Ligand binder design. Sequence first.
Ligand SMILES: [Zn+2]
Length: 108
Amino acid sequence: VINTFDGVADYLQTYHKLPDNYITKSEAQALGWVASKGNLADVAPGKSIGGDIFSNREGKLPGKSGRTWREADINYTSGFRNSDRILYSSDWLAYKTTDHYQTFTKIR
Ligand SMILES: [Zn+2]
């Protein structure tokens, strides 16, 4: 699976899509994923949560009309989700967060 900051970052900029080990939260729920139980690895082996729209309500990531922000989990293998996320824009900007969206730094 591609689930490293660099790996994912690089695949996105070239191919313009997340690698196939990613699924959105609603797709995972539909397969039996129960967030409170941390069972993703059981119902969707080798998948990580990724691809959902990220709000940017607190305007922490730089905006621009027509720009949409998405998120993907990084370094996830099994159990409860971690605090690692890659945030990528529709124009292929890539930012990293290791602390649950508190802070971000550019990686691409
Ligand atoms: Zn393309």
